[PDB]
Amino acid sequence: TGLAAISDALAADLAGLSFSSPVAHVYNPLLYAREPHVAYLSRFGSPPKEVLFVGMDPGPWGMAQTGVPFGEVAVVTEWLGINGTVTRPAGEHPKKRVDGFACRRSEVSGRRLWGFIRERFGTPERFFARFFVANYCPLLFLTAEGGNITPDKLRRGEQEPLFAACDLALRRTVVLLRPRVVIGVGAFAEARCHEALEGFDVEVGRIIHPSDWAGTALRQLAELGVDF
């Protein structure tokens, strides 16, 4: 009943959703990049975790390419040692191609976050012993011009089932990993954590989106009582 089941369930939930204007294209990396994503979940997501980092943040050159939250190609391959089959989405847009691990573009938010993590902990085993990183809403929303759309710009009628599925996924994730603290990456992620994890006996907090960054993040982490 591990994380892979949760991600697959979430993938099915997202796949059954419909989106209106201005959404022209939807990327679902949980499906087309299931293999590296599940590699990530299986290798590094073993319960229990103490702190759960939650992203909101699929970017086109990060998780959209590698299936790993904040997953810049370079850090996913070199540091996490993750390889996988990544097929192109049915709704792929020319301006935002999914080249997978062949992708030459760098996701610098992911680069900064994971680089920071690698700095602090050195090896993945040290970090993932106590920590994990998850994406709250792993869909990518694009316009006909290939411009990025964020979930807050969706209509409530469409936004509600989306957040229902995502909230469900996050709840299951928290139940499974049993974290002491759930830390949103950015205030928006924290807000969603907050609603999703309403009745939960867990501490919710946030670090500054990546987006002195490292110093601010460190202070926020210290205030949440987590040694980093």
Side-chain angles (χ1 to χ4, degrees), residues 87-94 96 98-104 106-144 146-155 157-180:
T87 62
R88 305 191 186 264
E92 187 188 60
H93 190 278
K96 298 272 187 50
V98 177
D99 297 322
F101 292 101
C103 181
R104 301 292 300 278
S106 164
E107 180 74 18
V108 343
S109 83
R111 190 178 75 222
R112 184 75 180 174
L113 179 57
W114 284 115
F116 177 58
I117 284 151
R118 167 169 51 184
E119 171 194 324
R120 310 299 296 181
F121 291 83
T123 68
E125 271 55 51
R126 227 99 64 179
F127 178 72
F128 288 111
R130 295 167 56 227
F131 297 89
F132 194 55
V133 185
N135 196 304
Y136 171 76
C137 187
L139 299 179
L140 196 72
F141 298 105
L142 307 172
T143 62
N148 184 62
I149 312 157
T150 55
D152 55 302
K153 293 182 175 41
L154 297 174
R155 167 177 26 164
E158 277 166 7
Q159 206 194 47
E160 264 156 6
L162 175 55
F163 287 168
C166 289
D167 284 10
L168 175 58
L170 176 56
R171 276 199 295 278
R172 295 169 170 167
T173 302
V174 168
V175 169
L176 175 60
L177 300 177
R178 307 178 64 185
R180 179 182 62 88

Coordinates of all heavy atoms in Angstrom, one line a residue, residues 87-180, unseen atoms left out:
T87 N 8.0 8.9 -21.8 CA 7.3 9.1 -23.1 C 6.7 10.5 -23.1 O 6.4 11.1 -22.1 CB 6.3 8.0 -23.3 OG1 5.2 8.1 -22.3 CG2 6.9 6.6 -23.3
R88 N 6.4 11.0 -24.3 CA 5.9 12.3 -24.5 C 4.4 12.2 -24.2 O 3.7 11.3 -24.6 CB 6.2 12.8 -25.9 CG 7.6 12.8 -26.2 CD 8.0 13.6 -27.5 NE 9.4 13.4 -27.8 CZ 10.3 14.3 -27.5 NH1 10.0 15.4 -26.8 NH2 11.6 14.1 -27.9
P89 N 3.8 13.3 -23.6 CA 2.4 13.4 -23.3 C 1.6 13.4 -24.6 O 2.1 13.9 -25.6 CB 2.3 14.7 -22.5 CG 3.6 15.1 -22.1 CD 4.5 14.5 -23.1
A90 N 0.4 12.9 -24.6 CA -0.5 13.0 -25.8 C -0.7 14.4 -26.2 O -0.7 14.8 -27.3 CB -1.8 12.3 -25.5
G91 N -0.8 15.3 -25.2 CA -1.1 16.7 -25.4 C 0.2 17.6 -25.4 O 0.1 18.7 -25.0
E92 N 1.3 17.0 -25.8 CA 2.6 17.8 -25.8 C 2.5 19.0 -26.7 O 1.9 19.0 -27.7 CB 3.7 16.9 -26.3 CG 5.1 17.5 -26.2 CD 6.2 16.8 -26.8 OE1 6.1 16.5 -28.1 OE2 7.2 16.4 -26.1
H93 N 3.1 20.1 -26.2 CA 3.2 21.3 -27.0 C 4.6 21.5 -27.5 O 5.6 21.2 -26.7 CB 2.7 22.5 -26.1 CG 2.5 23.8 -26.9 ND1 3.6 24.6 -27.2 CD2 1.4 24.4 -27.4 CE1 3.1 25.6 -27.9 NE2 1.8 25.5 -28.0
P94 N 4.8 22.0 -28.7 CA 6.1 22.2 -29.3 C 7.0 23.1 -28.5 O 8.2 22.8 -28.5 CB 5.7 22.9 -30.6 CG 4.4 22.4 -31.0 CD 3.7 22.3 -29.6
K95 N 6.5 24.1 -27.8 CA 7.3 25.1 -27.1 C 7.8 24.5 -25.8 O 8.7 25.0 -25.1 CB 6.6 26.4 -26.8
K96 N 7.1 23.4 -25.3 CA 7.5 22.7 -24.1 C 7.6 21.2 -24.3 O 6.8 20.5 -23.7 CB 6.4 23.0 -23.0 CG 6.2 24.5 -22.7 CD 7.2 24.9 -21.6 CE 6.9 26.3 -21.1 NZ 5.4 26.5 -20.8
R97 N 8.6 20.8 -25.0 CA 8.7 19.4 -25.3 C 9.2 18.6 -24.1 O 10.0 19.1 -23.3 CB 9.7 19.2 -26.5
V98 N 8.8 17.4 -24.0 CA 9.2 16.5 -22.9 C 10.3 15.5 -23.5 O 9.9 14.5 -24.1 CB 8.0 15.7 -22.3 CG1 8.5 14.7 -21.3 CG2 7.0 16.7 -21.8
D99 N 11.5 15.9 -23.3 CA 12.6 15.1 -23.8 C 13.1 14.2 -22.7 O 14.1 13.4 -22.9 CB 13.8 16.0 -24.2 CG 13.4 16.9 -25.4 OD1 12.6 16.4 -26.3 OD2 13.8 18.1 -25.4
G100 N 12.5 14.2 -21.5 CA 12.8 13.3 -20.4 C 14.2 13.6 -19.9 O 14.5 14.8 -19.5
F101 N 15.1 12.6 -19.8 CA 16.4 12.8 -19.2 C 17.3 13.3 -20.3 O 18.5 13.6 -20.0 CB 16.9 11.5 -18.6 CG 16.1 11.1 -17.4 CD1 15.1 10.1 -17.4 CD2 16.4 11.7 -16.2 CE1 14.5 9.7 -16.3 CE2 15.7 11.3 -15.0 CZ 14.7 10.3 -15.1
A102 N 16.9 13.3 -21.5 CA 17.6 13.9 -22.7 C 17.4 15.4 -22.7 O 18.1 16.1 -23.5 CB 17.1 13.3 -24.0
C103 N 16.5 15.9 -21.8 CA 16.2 17.4 -21.8 C 17.5 18.2 -21.4 O 18.1 17.9 -20.3 CB 15.1 17.6 -20.8 SG 14.6 19.4 -20.7
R104 N 17.8 19.1 -22.2 CA 19.0 20.0 -21.9 C 18.7 21.2 -21.1 O 19.6 21.9 -20.7 CB 19.6 20.4 -23.3 CG 20.0 19.2 -24.2 CD 21.2 18.5 -23.6 NE 22.4 19.4 -23.4 CZ 23.2 19.7 -24.4 NH1 23.0 19.2 -25.6 NH2 24.2 20.5 -24.2
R105 N 17.4 21.5 -20.9 CA 17.0 22.6 -20.1 C 17.1 22.3 -18.6 O 16.9 21.2 -18.2 CB 15.6 23.1 -20.4
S106 N 17.5 23.3 -17.8 CA 17.7 23.1 -16.4 C 16.6 23.8 -15.6 O 16.3 25.0 -15.8 CB 19.0 23.6 -15.9 OG 19.1 23.8 -14.5
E107 N 16.0 23.1 -14.6 CA 15.0 23.6 -13.7 C 15.7 24.2 -12.5 O 16.0 23.4 -11.5 CB 14.0 22.5 -13.3 CG 12.9 23.0 -12.3 CD 11.8 23.9 -13.0 OE1 11.7 23.8 -14.2 OE2 11.1 24.6 -12.2
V108 N 15.9 25.5 -12.5 CA 16.8 26.1 -11.5 C 16.2 26.2 -10.1 O 16.9 26.3 -9.1 CB 17.3 27.5 -11.9 CG1 17.1 27.8 -13.4 CG2 16.6 28.6 -11.1
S109 N 14.9 26.2 -10.0 CA 14.3 26.1 -8.7 C 14.6 24.7 -8.1 O 14.9 24.6 -6.9 CB 12.7 26.3 -8.8 OG 12.1 25.1 -9.2
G110 N 14.5 23.7 -8.9 CA 14.8 22.3 -8.5 C 16.3 22.2 -8.2 O 16.7 21.5 -7.3
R111 N 17.1 22.8 -9.1 CA 18.5 22.9 -9.0 C 18.9 23.5 -7.6 O 19.8 22.9 -7.0 CB 19.2 23.7 -10.1 CG 20.7 23.6 -10.2 CD 21.2 24.4 -11.3 NE 21.2 25.8 -11.1 CZ 20.9 26.8 -11.9 NH1 20.5 26.4 -13.2 NH2 20.9 28.0 -11.6
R112 N 18.3 24.6 -7.3 CA 18.6 25.3 -6.1 C 18.2 24.5 -4.8 O 18.9 24.3 -3.9 CB 17.9 26.7 -6.1 CG 18.3 27.5 -4.9 CD 19.7 28.1 -5.1 NE 20.1 28.9 -4.0 CZ 21.4 29.4 -3.9 NH1 22.3 29.2 -4.8 NH2 21.7 30.2 -2.9
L113 N 17.0 23.9 -4.9 CA 16.4 23.2 -3.8 C 17.2 21.9 -3.5 O 17.7 21.7 -2.4 CB 15.0 22.8 -4.0 CG 14.3 22.1 -2.9 CD1 14.3 22.8 -1.6 CD2 12.8 21.8 -3.3
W114 N 17.4 21.1 -4.5 CA 18.1 19.8 -4.4 C 19.6 20.0 -4.2 O 20.2 19.2 -3.5 CB 17.9 19.0 -5.7 CG 16.5 18.3 -5.7 CD1 15.6 18.6 -6.6 CD2 16.0 17.4 -4.8 NE1 14.5 17.8 -6.4 CE2 14.7 17.1 -5.3 CE3 16.5 16.7 -3.7 CZ2 13.9 16.1 -4.6 CZ3 15.7 15.8 -3.1 CH2 14.4 15.5 -3.5
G115 N 20.2 21.1 -4.8 CA 21.6 21.4 -4.6 C 21.8 21.8 -3.1 O 22.8 21.5 -2.5
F116 N 20.8 22.6 -2.6 CA 20.9 23.0 -1.2 C 20.8 21.7 -0.3 O 21.6 21.5 0.6 CB 19.7 23.9 -0.8 CG 19.6 24.3 0.6 CD1 20.6 24.9 1.2 CD2 18.4 24.0 1.3 CE1 20.5 25.3 2.6 CE2 18.3 24.3 2.7 CZ 19.3 25.0 3.3
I117 N 19.9 20.8 -0.6 CA 19.7 19.6 0.1 C 21.0 18.7 0.1 O 21.5 18.2 1.1 CB 18.5 18.7 -0.4 CG1 17.2 19.3 0.0 CG2 18.7 17.3 0.0 CD1 16.1 19.1 -0.9
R118 N 21.6 18.6 -1.1 CA 22.8 17.8 -1.3 C 24.0 18.5 -0.5 O 24.9 17.8 0.0 CB 23.2 17.7 -2.8 CG 24.6 17.2 -3.0 CD 24.8 16.9 -4.5 NE 24.4 17.9 -5.4 CZ 24.4 17.8 -6.8 NH1 24.8 16.7 -7.3 NH2 24.0 18.8 -7.5
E119 N 24.0 19.8 -0.4 CA 25.0 20.5 0.3 C 24.8 20.1 1.8 O 25.8 19.7 2.4 CB 24.8 22.0 0.2 CG 25.7 22.8 1.1 CD 25.3 24.3 1.2 OE1 24.9 24.9 0.1 OE2 25.3 24.9 2.3
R120 N 23.6 20.3 2.3 CA 23.4 20.0 3.7 C 23.6 18.5 4.1 O 24.1 18.3 5.2 CB 21.9 20.4 4.1 CG 21.5 21.8 3.6 CD 22.4 22.9 4.3 NE 22.2 22.9 5.7 CZ 22.8 23.8 6.5 NH1 23.6 24.7 6.0 NH2 22.6 23.8 7.8
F121 N 23.3 17.6 3.3 CA 23.3 16.2 3.7 C 24.3 15.3 3.0 O 24.5 14.1 3.4 CB 21.9 15.6 3.5 CG 20.9 16.1 4.4 CD1 20.2 17.4 4.2 CD2 20.5 15.5 5.6 CE1 19.3 17.9 5.0 CE2 19.6 16.0 6.5 CZ 19.0 17.2 6.2
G122 N 24.9 15.7 1.9 CA 25.9 14.9 1.2 C 25.4 13.8 0.4 O 25.5 13.7 -0.9
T123 N 24.8 12.8 1.0 CA 24.3 11.6 0.4 C 22.7 11.5 0.5 O 22.2 12.0 1.5 CB 24.9 10.3 0.9 OG1 24.4 10.1 2.3 CG2 26.4 10.4 0.9
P124 N 22.1 11.0 -0.5 CA 20.6 10.9 -0.5 C 20.1 10.1 0.7 O 19.0 10.4 1.2 CB 20.3 10.1 -1.8 CG 21.4 10.5 -2.7 CD 22.6 10.7 -1.8
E125 N 20.9 9.1 1.2 CA 20.5 8.3 2.3 C 20.3 9.1 3.6 O 19.5 8.8 4.4 CB 21.4 7.1 2.5 CG 21.0 5.9 1.7 CD 20.8 6.1 0.2 OE1 21.8 6.7 -0.4 OE2 19.8 5.8 -0.3
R126 N 21.2 10.0 3.8 CA 21.2 10.9 5.0 C 20.0 11.8 5.0 O 19.3 11.9 6.0 CB 22.5 11.8 5.1 CG 23.1 11.8 6.4 CD 24.3 10.9 6.5 NE 25.4 11.3 5.5 CZ 26.5 10.7 5.4 NH1 26.8 9.6 6.1 NH2 27.4 11.1 4.5
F127 N 19.6 12.4 3.9 CA 18.5 13.2 3.7 C 17.2 12.4 3.9 O 16.3 12.8 4.7 CB 18.5 14.0 2.4 CG 17.3 14.9 2.1 CD1 17.2 16.0 2.9 CD2 16.4 14.5 1.2 CE1 16.1 16.9 2.6 CE2 15.3 15.3 0.9 CZ 15.1 16.5 1.7
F128 N 17.0 11.4 3.0 CA 15.8 10.7 2.9 C 15.5 9.8 4.1 O 14.4 9.2 4.3 CB 15.7 9.9 1.6 CG 15.6 10.7 0.4 CD1 16.6 10.8 -0.5 CD2 14.4 11.4 0.1 CE1 16.5 11.6 -1.6 CE2 14.3 12.1 -1.0 CZ 15.3 12.2 -1.9
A129 N 16.5 9.7 5.0 CA 16.3 9.0 6.3 C 15.2 9.7 7.1 O 14.4 9.0 7.8 CB 17.6 9.0 7.1
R130 N 15.2 11.0 7.0 CA 14.2 11.8 7.8 C 13.3 12.6 7.0 O 12.2 13.0 7.4 CB 15.0 12.7 8.8 CG 15.8 12.1 9.8 CD 16.7 13.1 10.5 NE 16.0 14.2 11.0 CZ 16.3 15.5 10.8 NH1 17.4 15.8 10.1 NH2 15.6 16.5 11.4
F131 N 13.6 12.8 5.7 CA 12.9 13.8 4.9 C 12.3 13.1 3.6 O 12.7 12.0 3.2 CB 13.8 14.9 4.4 CG 14.3 15.8 5.6 CD1 15.5 15.5 6.3 CD2 13.6 16.9 6.0 CE1 15.9 16.2 7.3 CE2 14.0 17.7 7.0 CZ 15.2 17.4 7.7
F132 N 11.4 13.8 3.0 CA 10.9 13.5 1.7 C 10.4 14.7 1.0 O 10.0 15.7 1.6 CB 9.8 12.4 1.8 CG 9.4 11.7 0.5 CD1 10.4 11.1 -0.3 CD2 8.1 11.7 0.0 CE1 10.1 10.5 -1.5 CE2 7.8 11.1 -1.2 CZ 8.8 10.5 -1.9
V133 N 10.3 14.6 -0.4 CA 9.8 15.7 -1.1 C 8.7 15.2 -2.0 O 8.8 14.2 -2.7 CB 10.8 16.4 -2.0 CG1 10.3 17.6 -2.7 CG2 12.0 16.8 -1.2
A134 N 7.5 15.9 -2.0 CA 6.4 15.5 -2.8 C 5.8 16.7 -3.5 O 5.9 17.8 -3.1 CB 5.3 14.8 -1.9
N135 N 5.1 16.4 -4.6 CA 4.4 17.5 -5.4 C 2.9 17.4 -5.1 O 2.3 16.3 -5.4 CB 4.7 17.3 -6.9 CG 4.3 18.6 -7.6 OD1 3.2 19.1 -7.6 ND2 5.3 19.2 -8.3
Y136 N 2.3 18.4 -4.6 CA 0.9 18.5 -4.3 C 0.0 18.3 -5.6 O -0.9 17.5 -5.6 CB 0.5 19.8 -3.7 CG -1.0 20.0 -3.5 CD1 -1.7 19.3 -2.5 CD2 -1.7 20.9 -4.3 CE1 -3.0 19.5 -2.4 CE2 -3.0 21.1 -4.2 CZ -3.7 20.4 -3.2 OH -5.1 20.6 -3.1
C137 N 0.4 19.1 -6.6 CA -0.4 19.1 -7.9 C 0.5 18.9 -9.1 O 1.0 19.9 -9.6 CB -1.2 20.3 -8.0 SG -2.4 20.4 -9.4
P138 N 0.8 17.7 -9.5 CA 1.8 17.4 -10.5 C 1.4 17.5 -11.9 O 2.1 17.1 -12.8 CB 2.1 15.9 -10.2 CG 1.0 15.3 -9.4 CD 0.0 16.5 -9.1
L139 N 0.3 18.2 -12.2 CA -0.1 18.5 -13.6 C 0.5 19.8 -14.1 O 0.7 20.7 -13.3 CB -1.6 18.6 -13.7 CG -2.5 17.4 -13.4 CD1 -4.0 17.7 -13.5 CD2 -2.1 16.2 -14.2
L140 N 0.8 19.8 -15.4 CA 1.3 21.0 -16.0 C 0.2 21.6 -16.9 O -0.3 20.9 -17.8 CB 2.6 20.8 -16.8 CG 3.4 22.0 -17.2 CD1 4.1 22.6 -16.0 CD2 4.4 21.7 -18.3
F141 N -0.1 22.8 -16.7 CA -1.2 23.4 -17.5 C -0.7 24.5 -18.5 O 0.0 25.4 -18.1 CB -2.2 24.1 -16.6 CG -2.9 23.1 -15.7 CD1 -2.6 23.1 -14.3 CD2 -3.9 22.3 -16.1 CE1 -3.2 22.2 -13.5 CE2 -4.6 21.4 -15.3 CZ -4.2 21.3 -14.0
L142 N -0.9 24.2 -19.8 CA -0.4 25.1 -20.8 C -1.5 25.7 -21.7 O -2.5 25.1 -22.0 CB 0.6 24.4 -21.7 CG 1.8 23.7 -21.0 CD1 2.6 22.9 -21.9 CD2 2.6 24.7 -20.2
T143 N -1.3 27.0 -22.1 CA -2.1 27.6 -23.1 C -1.8 27.1 -24.5 O -0.8 26.4 -24.7 CB -2.0 29.1 -23.1 OG1 -0.7 29.5 -23.4 CG2 -2.4 29.7 -21.7
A144 N -2.5 27.6 -25.5 CA -2.3 27.2 -26.9 C -0.9 27.7 -27.3 O -0.2 27.1 -28.2 CB -3.3 27.8 -27.8
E145 N -0.4 28.8 -26.7 CA 0.9 29.4 -27.0 C 2.0 28.7 -26.2 O 3.2 29.0 -26.4 CB 0.9 30.9 -26.7
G146 N 1.6 27.7 -25.3 CA 2.5 27.0 -24.5 C 2.9 27.7 -23.2 O 3.9 27.4 -22.6
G147 N 2.1 28.7 -22.9 CA 2.4 29.5 -21.7 C 1.9 28.7 -20.4 O 0.8 28.1 -20.5
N148 N 2.6 28.8 -19.3 CA 2.3 28.1 -18.1 C 1.0 28.7 -17.4 O 0.9 29.9 -17.3 CB 3.5 28.2 -17.1 CG 3.2 27.4 -15.9 OD1 3.0 26.2 -15.9 ND2 3.2 28.0 -14.7
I149 N 0.2 27.8 -17.0 CA -1.0 28.2 -16.2 C -0.9 27.6 -14.8 O -0.7 26.4 -14.7 CB -2.3 27.8 -16.8 CG1 -2.3 28.2 -18.3 CG2 -3.5 28.4 -16.1 CD1 -3.3 27.4 -19.1
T150 N -1.1 28.4 -13.8 CA -1.1 27.9 -12.4 C -2.5 27.6 -11.9 O -3.4 28.3 -12.3 CB -0.4 28.9 -11.4 OG1 -1.0 30.2 -11.5 CG2 1.1 29.0 -11.8
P151 N -2.7 26.6 -11.0 CA -4.0 26.2 -10.6 C -5.0 27.3 -10.0 O -6.2 27.1 -10.1 CB -3.7 25.2 -9.5 CG -2.4 24.6 -9.9 CD -1.6 25.8 -10.5
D152 N -4.4 28.3 -9.5 CA -5.2 29.4 -8.9 C -6.0 30.2 -10.0 O -7.0 30.8 -9.7 CB -4.4 30.4 -8.1 CG -3.2 31.0 -8.9 OD1 -2.4 30.1 -9.4 OD2 -3.1 32.2 -9.1
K153 N -5.5 30.0 -11.3 CA -6.2 30.7 -12.4 C -7.3 29.8 -13.0 O -8.0 30.3 -13.9 CB -5.2 31.0 -13.5 CG -4.2 32.1 -13.1 CD -3.2 32.4 -14.2 CE -2.3 33.6 -13.8 NZ -1.8 33.5 -12.4
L154 N -7.5 28.6 -12.5 CA -8.6 27.7 -12.9 C -9.9 28.2 -12.3 O -9.9 28.9 -11.3 CB -8.3 26.3 -12.6 CG -7.0 25.7 -13.2 CD1 -6.7 24.3 -12.7 CD2 -7.2 25.7 -14.7
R155 N -11.0 27.8 -12.9 CA -12.3 28.2 -12.3 C -12.6 27.2 -11.2 O -12.1 26.1 -11.1 CB -13.4 28.1 -13.4 CG -14.8 28.2 -12.9 CD -15.9 28.2 -14.0 NE -15.4 27.6 -15.2 CZ -16.2 27.3 -16.2 NH1 -17.5 27.4 -16.1 NH2 -15.6 26.7 -17.3
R156 N -13.4 27.7 -10.2 CA -13.7 27.0 -9.0 C -14.4 25.6 -9.3 O -14.1 24.6 -8.6 CB -14.6 27.8 -8.1
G157 N -15.2 25.6 -10.3 CA -15.9 24.4 -10.7 C -14.9 23.3 -11.2 O -15.1 22.1 -10.9
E158 N -13.8 23.7 -11.8 CA -12.8 22.8 -12.2 C -11.7 22.6 -11.2 O -11.1 21.6 -11.0 CB -12.1 23.2 -13.5 CG -12.9 22.8 -14.8 CD -12.5 23.5 -16.0 OE1 -11.5 24.2 -16.0 OE2 -13.1 23.3 -17.1
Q159 N -11.4 23.7 -10.4 CA -10.4 23.7 -9.4 C -10.7 22.8 -8.2 O -9.9 22.2 -7.6 CB -10.2 25.2 -8.9 CG -8.8 25.5 -8.3 CD -8.8 26.8 -7.5 OE1 -9.6 27.0 -6.7 NE2 -7.8 27.6 -7.8
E160 N -12.0 22.7 -7.9 CA -12.5 21.9 -6.8 C -12.2 20.4 -6.9 O -11.7 19.8 -5.9 CB -14.0 22.2 -6.5 CG -14.3 23.3 -5.5 CD -15.6 23.9 -5.7 OE1 -16.4 23.4 -6.5 OE2 -15.9 24.9 -4.9
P161 N -12.6 19.8 -8.0 CA -12.2 18.3 -8.1 C -10.7 18.1 -8.1 O -10.2 17.1 -7.5 CB -12.9 17.9 -9.4 CG -13.0 19.1 -10.2 CD -13.3 20.2 -9.2
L162 N -10.0 19.0 -8.8 CA -8.5 18.9 -8.8 C -7.9 18.9 -7.4 O -7.2 18.0 -7.1 CB -8.0 20.1 -9.6 CG -6.4 20.3 -9.6 CD1 -5.8 19.1 -10.1 CD2 -6.0 21.5 -10.4
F163 N -8.3 19.9 -6.6 CA -7.8 20.0 -5.3 C -8.4 18.9 -4.4 O -7.8 18.6 -3.4 CB -8.1 21.4 -4.7 CG -7.3 22.5 -5.2 CD1 -7.7 23.8 -5.0 CD2 -6.2 22.2 -6.0 CE1 -6.9 24.8 -5.5 CE2 -5.4 23.3 -6.5 CZ -5.8 24.6 -6.2
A164 N -9.5 18.3 -4.8 CA -10.1 17.2 -4.0 C -9.2 16.0 -4.2 O -8.8 15.4 -3.2 CB -11.5 16.9 -4.5
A165 N -8.8 15.7 -5.4 CA -7.9 14.6 -5.7 C -6.5 14.8 -5.1 O -6.0 13.9 -4.4 CB -7.8 14.4 -7.2
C166 N -6.0 16.0 -5.3 CA -4.7 16.3 -4.7 C -4.6 16.2 -3.2 O -3.7 15.7 -2.6 CB -4.2 17.7 -5.2 SG -3.8 17.8 -7.0
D167 N -5.7 16.8 -2.6 CA -5.8 16.8 -1.1 C -5.9 15.3 -0.6 O -5.2 15.0 0.4 CB -7.1 17.5 -0.7 CG -6.9 19.0 -0.7 OD1 -5.9 19.5 -1.2 OD2 -7.8 19.7 -0.2
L168 N -6.6 14.5 -1.3 CA -6.7 13.1 -1.0 C -5.4 12.4 -1.0 O -5.0 11.7 -0.1 CB -7.7 12.4 -1.9 CG -7.9 10.9 -1.7 CD1 -8.3 10.5 -0.3 CD2 -8.9 10.3 -2.7
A169 N -4.6 12.6 -2.1 CA -3.3 12.1 -2.3 C -2.4 12.5 -1.2 O -1.6 11.7 -0.6 CB -2.7 12.5 -3.6
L170 N -2.4 13.8 -0.8 CA -1.5 14.3 0.2 C -1.9 13.8 1.6 O -1.0 13.4 2.4 CB -1.6 15.9 0.2 CG -0.8 16.6 1.3 CD1 0.7 16.2 1.3 CD2 -0.9 18.1 1.3
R171 N -3.2 13.6 1.9 CA -3.6 13.0 3.1 C -3.1 11.6 3.2 O -2.5 11.2 4.2 CB -5.1 13.0 3.2 CG -5.7 14.3 3.8 CD -7.1 14.1 4.3 NE -8.0 13.7 3.2 CZ -8.6 14.6 2.4 NH1 -8.4 15.9 2.5 NH2 -9.4 14.2 1.4
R172 N -3.2 10.8 2.2 CA -2.7 9.4 2.1 C -1.2 9.4 2.3 O -0.7 8.5 3.1 CB -3.1 8.7 0.8 CG -4.6 8.5 0.6 CD -4.9 8.1 -0.8 NE -6.3 7.6 -0.9 CZ -6.9 7.4 -2.1 NH1 -6.3 7.6 -3.2 NH2 -8.2 7.1 -2.1
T173 N -0.5 10.3 1.7 CA 0.9 10.4 1.8 C 1.4 10.7 3.2 O 2.3 10.0 3.8 CB 1.5 11.5 0.9 OG1 1.1 11.2 -0.5 CG2 3.0 11.5 1.0
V174 N 0.7 11.6 3.9 CA 1.0 11.9 5.3 C 0.7 10.8 6.2 O 1.5 10.4 7.1 CB 0.2 13.2 5.7 CG1 0.3 13.4 7.2 CG2 0.7 14.4 5.0
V175 N -0.5 10.1 6.0 CA -0.8 8.9 6.8 C 0.3 7.9 6.7 O 0.6 7.2 7.7 CB -2.2 8.3 6.3 CG1 -2.4 7.0 6.9 CG2 -3.3 9.3 6.7
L176 N 0.8 7.6 5.4 CA 1.8 6.6 5.2 C 3.1 6.9 5.8 O 3.8 6.1 6.4 CB 1.9 6.3 3.7 CG 3.0 5.3 3.3 CD1 2.7 4.0 4.0 CD2 3.1 5.2 1.8
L177 N 3.6 8.1 5.6 CA 5.0 8.5 6.0 C 5.1 8.9 7.4 O 6.1 8.9 8.0 CB 5.5 9.6 5.1 CG 5.6 9.4 3.6 CD1 6.0 10.7 2.9 CD2 6.5 8.2 3.3
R178 N 3.9 9.2 8.0 CA 3.8 9.6 9.4 C 4.8 10.8 9.8 O 5.6 10.6 10.7 CB 4.1 8.4 10.3 CG 3.2 7.2 10.0 CD 3.5 6.1 10.9 NE 3.3 6.4 12.3 CZ 3.6 5.6 13.4 NH1 4.2 4.4 13.1 NH2 3.3 6.0 14.6
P179 N 4.7 11.9 9.1 CA 5.7 13.0 9.4 C 5.3 13.8 10.6 O 4.1 13.9 10.9 CB 5.7 13.8 8.1 CG 4.3 13.7 7.7 CD 3.8 12.3 8.0
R180 N 6.3 14.4 11.3 CA 6.0 15.3 12.4 C 5.6 16.6 11.9 O 4.7 17.3 12.5 CB 7.2 15.4 13.3 CG 7.0 16.3 14.5 CD 8.3 16.5 15.3 NE 9.4 17.0 14.6 CZ 9.7 18.3 14.4 NH1 8.9 19.2 15.0 NH2 10.7 18.7 13.7

